Amino acid sequence: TDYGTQLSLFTHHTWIGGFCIVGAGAHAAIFMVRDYDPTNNYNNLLDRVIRHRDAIISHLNWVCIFLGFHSFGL
Amino acid sequence: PFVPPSWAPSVFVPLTGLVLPAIAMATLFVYIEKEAP
Amino acid sequence: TSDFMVHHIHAFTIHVTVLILLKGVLFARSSRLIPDKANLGFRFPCDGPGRGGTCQVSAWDHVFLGLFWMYNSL
Amino acid sequence: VWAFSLMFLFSGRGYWQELIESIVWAHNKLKVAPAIQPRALSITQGRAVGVAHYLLGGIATTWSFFLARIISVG
Amino acid sequence: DIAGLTPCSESKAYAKLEKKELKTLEKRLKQYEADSAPAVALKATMERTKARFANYAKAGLLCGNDGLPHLIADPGLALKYGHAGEVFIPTFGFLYVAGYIGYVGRQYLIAVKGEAKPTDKEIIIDVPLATKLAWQGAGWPLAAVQELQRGTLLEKEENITVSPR
Amino acid sequence: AHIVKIYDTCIGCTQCVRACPLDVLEMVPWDGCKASQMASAPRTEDCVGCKRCETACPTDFLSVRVYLGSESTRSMGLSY
Amino acid sequence: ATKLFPKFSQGLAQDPTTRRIWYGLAMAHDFESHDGMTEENLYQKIFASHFGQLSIIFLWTSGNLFHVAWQGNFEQWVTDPVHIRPIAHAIWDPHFGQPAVEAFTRGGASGPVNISTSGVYQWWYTIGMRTNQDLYVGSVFLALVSAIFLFAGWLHLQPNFQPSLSWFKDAESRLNHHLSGLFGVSSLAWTGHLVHVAIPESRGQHVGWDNFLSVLPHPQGLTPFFTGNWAAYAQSPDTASHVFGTAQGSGQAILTFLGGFHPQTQSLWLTDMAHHHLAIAVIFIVAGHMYRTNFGIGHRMQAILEAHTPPSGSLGAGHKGLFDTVNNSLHFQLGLALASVGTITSLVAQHMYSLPPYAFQAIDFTTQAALYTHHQYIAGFIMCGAFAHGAIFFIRDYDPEQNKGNVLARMLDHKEALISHLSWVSLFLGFHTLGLYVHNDVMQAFGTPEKQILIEPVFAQWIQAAHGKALYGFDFLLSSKTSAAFANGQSLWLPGWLDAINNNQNSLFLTIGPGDFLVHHAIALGLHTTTLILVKGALDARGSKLMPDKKDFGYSFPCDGPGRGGTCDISAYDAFYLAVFWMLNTIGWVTFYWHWKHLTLWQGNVAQFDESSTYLMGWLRDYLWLNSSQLINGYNPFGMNSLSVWAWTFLFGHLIYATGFMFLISWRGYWQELIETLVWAHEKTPLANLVYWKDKPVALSIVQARLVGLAHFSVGYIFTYAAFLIASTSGRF
Amino acid sequence: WTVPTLNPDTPSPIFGGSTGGLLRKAQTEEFYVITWEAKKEQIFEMPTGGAAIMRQGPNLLKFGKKEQCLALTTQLRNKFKLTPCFYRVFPDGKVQYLHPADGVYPEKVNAGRVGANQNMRRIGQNVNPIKVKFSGRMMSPAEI
Ligand code: CLA
Ligand code: CLA
Ligand code: CLA
Ligand code: CLA
Ligand code: CLA
Ligand code: CLA
Ligand code: CLA
Ligand code: CLA
Ligand code: CLA
Ligand SMILES: CC1=C(/C=C/C(C)=C/C=C\C(C)=C\C=C\C=C(C)\C=C\C=C(C)\C=C\C2=C(C)CCCC2(C)C)C(C)(C)CCC1
Ligand code: SF4
Ligand SMILES: [Ca+2]
């Protein structure tokens, strides 16, 4: 029944979640730059991801363009 | 007089909007990619 | 219909934020533009105006852009 | 604050460094130049300041709008 | 009077504005009891409003057609029609405090400049010297004028860095 | 191609050559400094313009300067 | 390999990327930067460009005349210029449905048409146009003139017709001919048109090419001019009951100085305008005989410049050598011309809204708002261009050895002091204006509007009282009836001028209060900050402590790299780039002030502006939020009306502005890496790798990015404000 | 000293392959080949992404641009203390030795080198742009 509390709580928790997600990506990049060592990641999942990162980024870029067109064009 | 006909917009607007820009775009695009001897 | 359109808008914005963050994570060590990005660290402004311009190539700048996209999405 | 962010996001530290040099000349004329040499914000710092102000301004704008509206009619 | 304005003591819009403010405060006060904290707070606010309006009308301020006071920035008009307290006296007051702060900071910088490590004296404030200069800055206009007459206030052209033109 | 120039204020500290990421600069013998060396740019056709050499130069003002010129495949650092 | 485009730069032609097209398009007018460019060829290319621009201007004017004569309602608007809206041109859009066709069908037309806001109807009606035949003849004449100018531009580039280099540097002859011929003779011809056509047409007498050689403009017929009794020309002027376009109450005078405005049209008298053009024509013609060209008599600008050095040595060498550094530098002349043009444009905007020159122009509120805003934004852009070209002059054409000790070298000698004082003025104005606004906002929020600081603008009100306004009560100069300045004009122009300035129903010296004082301080802040950025960029263009050799890098370059802490936006081009935002913000403040004050005046409630212009909440709610209710309602689920195009334009400008923010915030590197990934994706895709690009795809350069973001920002800004202004003014009235 | 000859039948490090490899430029314009001698097998980082294992003895690799080859050269010299060298290979089969140019690395001074693009003056002694104006094309005051 307290609409103010409901709206404020949803908005606040959503913003905290989004900020924490961006921070997660930031620390993933920090690990990749500082703590990553190729001598212990020869043929694991992380090495293969780095190997086909171009394909990953290209497909994600295309799906972003497709979603943008079919979402904003409407 | 100098007054255009009644059908003049129905012919000049599609011309200036589709005929002239397509010809101009194709001509300019061909000109830009011309290789020097 | 309005709910469908706004849900697709949310999906598109989430995908773009993921694209910026994942691009900054995968291409944090190296890229086709700068092969020794890991030597420059995680947070550096650029690599000079060379190669046409290398402004915002660090992973930190990717986090910086992801912040704007997260703000837009949320 | 949000519009203030646009000052740090659309400009570069070279202009600010030269402007600071002119201000430093004004200080040196009246013998009021500090020993700590005033230097403009770094490129990364400028980007961080801009994104921080952009986020704070936009989030606070939406916060005021939501709270005032939901408290008045809710 | 000046610029077609009327004094606030004889303006109808001024009195109507005061009655409007007192009316909304009294209307908000009617919903509470008589010996409760919100009622006492509202009565205190109403008394503050009455005192503020009485003091503004007593000061001889000039009001406009909106019922709000106006300030006279011209020194001649202010000193000729009794409006020097609006913008003249506060101007000189700010000039005194501004030059006061500026002279205290300048004296501290020049004092720590001849030391071994001035940067340490800049990030870590020397409280005794700063306090002494803060107390001695009361004679800032006299000291500044004496410095200007001696030629020691400014630095020479040859000792200042400039661009290569 | 970009224009890379070396001025007479070069002290022969060899820091600009080590900071060059595309092997454009080198050291040649000289008689104007104590180190008796001087920086040279004989492969400017491969320079991209990163200005890492300018960052690594310790003289005031700089001894090595980079001027952006005509862009090409090597100057733009394109792998395609 | 090397491509044909561009033909003026072999280095850009050898570029195998997409940067070649963008750079070739952006450097086509940079004649000094082409391959194999000399001074004579440079001047000839500029001459041809000038002719082409003149042809474009004349053809555009002819197009406007033709469309008004064809799809406009000028023949019906002249009969009722108060209750009939002007028509710009028809609309032929196959995308329009039935509601759009009937929604845009207005103004007495037979189909969808656009209602004009340019004000050409009032101007053409005032100068003498009455029928559509006149507009058609004018359009044909202007089209032929444009064709002649285009042919002249082509002819002057061919051999035996190209002017010599010394011909382009004949400053004395060119200035004498422009002051006497282009300025004096043109003004004299306009006086002849006003006396022979405009004045008789406004009195109900049709005078055209078929009968102007037999109709006398005055009953005395050139006799008082030759006999020196010019006072007979001002006899029997138009009375106070004159009806424009008819002979009811029309006088017989052709050159008067009654002043004020016409009682019906609320515009300037035609006789006064003709007299004005005659006087300025005589002055300009006389001024055209000041410089020595080929007859011994006259002056030499070099001698006057070299003979203007103070003996005390305060200005150093004075103006010695200024003739050579200006005559040999095209950027200096262009900067001076742009500075004067921008100032004159602002003067035009102010004088046209305050003193309406065209008939039935004051009643058209949309025309006033659009014209003032258009001229002010154009003036702002032109001023920024003047300062930009000044910086270009310092980098490319400044010679310290030739300008040794003169005023020009002394400008760079104390540039730090200038930038520091400009910084102090901008800081003081910004802190005080923002502080007073926030203080008034807090007082209005706390329910105490009497506690806000409202400084009365006694200086500008004192000036208004000097002009003759008795509302304030200073009673001096033209305000006091016993003054010599007042009694000396009571027989020539003061009656009409005083009657027009004391009337509060016009835009002639409107009443001002604390809100006007505060917004004027905001205007001063914007002007000083824009001047600070431009002046600092022009003086620091040749070098500073951060970049001692900036003059060797040209006017526009990306940066000096991340070394020395960072050198982002260090060039003079970047200073201009940052100054464009301040120019747009300053013009935005002046146009907001103009629109709100005039809206409250036209609505009959100036107290609303006087009471809400002191706090920013009043500006945001009572002006931006209150006047956009009809604009955003152009199209909604309940249907649409003729105001839907402005709503679409509003959202269009918002989208362009936000798109510019992308190029302004995100920088090259991220985009180049993304492009590389896309290149790999296209190269490794079957059925699509067969179609390969001819130019290697690369990210936009830093300078190109700044220009693209600035262009989107300015376009969105302009379109958004123009749409809001026209929609609010048209819906409200 | 003698200019090395490229050996195409040289073993390459064991790498699983990646998407940051060569493109159509390697077949249409040019590419680069880096060769080095390794004393023992060791896992190193590829400049285009991924971890490869350099074999014992000769090792050959292909890259799209010279920056990738010099980056790998710097990594091998500073992390494993090796002596790598690279060439530029054209689609017609022409091989051009690039680094080190004289067999000696450019950080140390070597006899026989001739300084080029050197100005026997300082920056403050450069001429004004007005003196280099109206030239054949856009010329900077430092180009002379
Ligand atoms: C569990 C959460 C967490 C933790 C432990 C860390 C820890 C760390 N982060 Mg990180 N980060 C996080 C979340 C977290 N982060 C989130 C949620 C984001 C998204 C915004 C980021 C984005 C981020 C970036 C981009 C960077 C780091 C960096 C770092 C490292 C250096 C510390 C630092 O930031 O400098 C000191 C901390 C500060 C100076 C505090 C800044 C204060 C802000 C600007 C004020 C916030 C405004 C406030 C809420 C409103 C006040 C109103 C005002 C009027 C007073 C450190 C290991 C840096 C790094 O990698 O080091 C190399 C780095 O560059 N972080
Ligand atoms: C409203 C302004 C604006 C717009 C339109 C865009 C648009 C876009 N951004 Mg962007 N961005 C913005 C602001 C904006 N951004 C700002 C301020 C920042 C700074 C933080 C960024 C930072 C940013 C990043 C970091 C990235 C993007 C990316 C993208 C692209 C995503 C692909 C997509 O959405 O598919 C569709 C395209 C659109 C929705 C754009 C509008 C297209 C219109 C609606 C279609 C109209 C077609 C019309 C018929 C054309 C006819 C023309 C006629 C005259 C002939 C897209 C083109 C991402 C990318 O590169 O792509 C994956 C990317 O990673 N942006
Ligand atoms: C991107 C979002 C979007 C979408 C989904 C639509 C959709 C539509 N629009 Mg619209 N439009 C858009 C954006 C969009 N528009 C924008 C941004 C504008 C403003 C500039 C307009 C302006 C506009 C106008 C003026 C009109 C439309 C109209 C239409 C309708 C018909 C168009 C048509 O027939 O063209 C033809 C389409 C094609 C030939 C190609 C279709 C794409 C195919 C299906 C994809 C194939 C890929 C496939 C999956 C590949 C498989 C791989 C392999 C295995 C084979 C249609 C339903 C018309 C209308 O109103 O209808 C009533 C019309 O008059 N639009
Ligand atoms: C610069 C002035 C100008 C402008 C802005 C317009 C604008 C317009 N005209 Mg108009 N026109 C003009 C001059 C102009 N005209 C002149 C001088 C004539 C007399 C010959 C005409 C004759 C004319 C007719 C008969 C019609 C229009 C129509 C229209 C509308 C449809 C779009 C169009 O371009 O049609 C076509 C425009 C033309 C045929 C005129 C082009 C002829 C000139 C000499 C060419 C100029 C070349 C140009 C400067 C080169 C650069 C442009 C570009 C390549 C970069 C549009 C609003 C149509 C309409 O009413 O829509 C409802 C229509 O039927 N015009
Ligand atoms: C500036 C000039 C211009 C002109 C004159 C038109 C004209 C037209 N557009 Mg179009 N459009 C334009 C610009 C223009 N558009 C731009 C810039 C965009 C991007 C924003 C679009 C996007 C757009 C969309 C999405 C659609 C249209 C459609 C249409 C048609 C309206 C359908 C109708 O109700 O009539 C009746 C329809 C007919 C009588 C059928 C006529 C068939 C075609 C149009 C003519 C014959 C083809 C011709 C031989 C080839 C010409 C190509 C030439 C350049 C070589 C119409 C003929 C709609 C459409 O295509 O209809 C299906 C529609 O879907 N337009
Ligand atoms: C910061 C800029 C500034 C501006 C724009 C003005 C503007 C004005 N001042 Mg002024 N004034 C200023 C600074 C300024 N003042 C400063 C710094 C001082 C301190 C020295 C004064 C002290 C001052 C005095 C004493 C008077 C004014 C007066 C005036 C008003 C008319 C006189 C005039 O224009 O000549 C410029 C003003 C001066 C050069 C100062 C000397 C006064 C001159 C000689 C005017 C006196 C003649 C007479 C009294 C005029 C009144 C005529 C009629 C109304 C009776 C006018 C609106 C007069 C006034 O209206 O009285 C209320 C007046 O007497 N001012
Ligand atoms: C009497 C002889 C004469 C005349 C009439 C002209 C006329 C002209 N010359 Mg020229 N010139 C002359 C002699 C003459 N010249 C001589 C002897 C030399 C050699 C020494 C030159 C060398 C020369 C050069 C090098 C150039 C010109 C140029 C021009 C054109 C300037 C274009 C322009 O700015 O628009 C006209 C400007 C005005 C009419 C003045 C406007 C005054 C203000 C700004 C406006 C105020 C008016 C009013 C309020 C606005 C009206 C409102 C409403 C009706 C819209 C112009 C048509 C340029 C050119 O060639 O263009 C092709 C140029 O490059 N001339
Ligand atoms: C009499 C006026 C005049 C003249 C003759 C010049 C002449 C010149 N200027 Mg200049 N300038 C002017 C006014 C003028 N300017 C004004 C008013 C400004 C302020 C805006 C500037 C600011 C300026 C800068 C910053 C620079 C120049 C430069 C130059 C030189 C060559 C560049 C060039 O023009 O290439 C061609 C010009 C272009 C290709 C224009 C760029 C494209 C624009 C952004 C169009 C965007 C509009 C958009 C499409 C509108 C459509 C919206 C709609 C579709 C919704 C040249 C000698 C450059 C220079 O000196 O080189 C070092 C330089 O850097 N000018
Ligand atoms: C709303 C946005 C905004 C604001 C407020 C400013 C403000 C300013 N700009 Mg700027 N600018 C902007 C946008 C903005 N700009 C944009 C988008 C651009 C294009 C990139 C520029 C480009 C630009 C340039 C190129 C220059 C400026 C300059 C200036 C300064 C002018 C001096 C002045 O007016 O003193 C007034 C001072 C203020 C208005 C500061 C605000 C006072 C605050 C609110 C008080 C502190 C609050 C409280 C006490 C403490 C709260 C902090 C808390 C965390 C504890 C000023 C600080 C010029 C300059 O540097 O001047 C020397 C300069 O050269 N601007
Ligand atoms: C950078 C540069 C430059 C410069 C520029 C500029 C300078 C700009 C600006 C500016 C401006 C824009 C200015 C203007 C001005 C104005 C003035 C200076 C005026 C005035 C006034 C007067 C004098 C008036 C008087 C009066 C009155 C008061 C009123 C009534 C009438 C009378 C007359 C009485 C150039 C290019 C040259 C070159 C070099 C570099
Ligand atoms: S870093 Fe500078 S001083 Fe040192 S060798 Fe290179 S050019 Fe000479
Ligand atoms: Ca007629």
Side-chain angles (χ1 to χ4, degrees), chain G residues 565-628:
Chain G
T567 44
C568 300
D569 284 292
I570 199 166
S571 67
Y573 178 96
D574 307 310
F576 157 88
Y577 164 66
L578 304 184
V580 174
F581 295 100
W582 263 90
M583 172 261 307
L584 289 178
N585 173 54
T586 312
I587 305 303
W589 289 347
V590 309
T591 44
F592 272 30
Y593 171 38
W594 198 99
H595 194 216
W596 199 13
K597 207 188 178 65
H598 275 80
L599 262 183
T600 46
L601 176 81
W602 299 327
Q603 279 163 344
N605 190 22
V606 291
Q608 182 68 264
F609 173 78
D610 294 341
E611 294 168 2
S612 288
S613 55
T614 72
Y615 56 109
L616 293 158
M617 186 43 91
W619 282 87
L620 174 71
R621 173 203 60 228
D622 308 341
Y623 166 65
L624 290 169
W625 172 92
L626 196 79
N627 289 295
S628 66

Side-chain angles (χ1 to χ4, degrees), chain C residues 19-20 23 27 31-33 37 46 48-49 51-57 62 64-65 68, chain G residues 558-562 665-674 676-677 680 699-702:
Chain C
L19 163 72
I20 305 151
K23 177 166 175 294
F27 286 93
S31 66
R32 258 172 166 114
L33 184 65
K37 197 185 293 192
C46 76
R51 319 167 184 103
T54 51
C55 308
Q56 290 171 11
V57 296
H62 288 70
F64 153 83
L65 299 166
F68 283 101
Chain G
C559 64
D560 203 17
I665 298 158
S666 56
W667 286 9
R668 188 162 201 279
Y670 166 88
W671 304 107
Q672 178 56 36
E673 288 171 340
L674 202 59
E676 283 163 344
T677 63
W680 174 91
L700 315 187
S701 70
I702 308 152

Side-chain angles (χ1 to χ4, degrees), chain G residues 331-332 334-336 339-340 343 383 386-387 389-391 393-394 408 535 538:
Chain G
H331 293 296
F332 203 116
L334 182 50
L336 285 169
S340 308
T343 315
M383 282 312 299
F387 276 102
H389 269 293
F393 154 73
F394 287 117
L408 192 54
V535 160

Side-chain angles (χ1 to χ4, degrees), chain H residues 9 12-13 20 32 39 41 45 47 50 53 70-71 80 95 99 101 109-110 120 132 134 137 142:
Chain H
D9 197 13
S12 52
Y32 296 80
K39 313 163 170 59
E41 210 172 353
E45 189 194 356
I53 319 180
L70 198 60
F80 315 110
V95 176
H99 167 87
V109 64
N110 180 47
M120 283 297 125
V132 303
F134 294 140
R137 77 277 186 190

Side-chain angles (χ1 to χ4, degrees), chain G residues 128-131 134 197 201 205-211:
Chain G
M129 306 309 219
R130 293 293 187 277
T131 64
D134 309 334
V197 179
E201 279 270 13
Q205 195 198 20
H206 165 72
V207 171
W209 292 116
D210 67 315
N211 66 333

Side-chain angles (χ1 to χ4, degrees), chain G residues 419-432 524-533 582:
Chain G
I419 300 158
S420 304
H421 293 75
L422 266 164
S423 164
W424 173 80
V425 170
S426 314
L427 272 168
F428 170 82
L429 285 170
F431 277 127
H432 284 54
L525 159 65
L527 292 192
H528 290 95
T529 314
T530 304
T531 310
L532 159 68
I533 306 155
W582 263 90

Side-chain angles (χ1 to χ4, degrees), chain G residues 69 200 208 341 391 553 671 686:
Chain G
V341 161
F553 279 73
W671 304 107

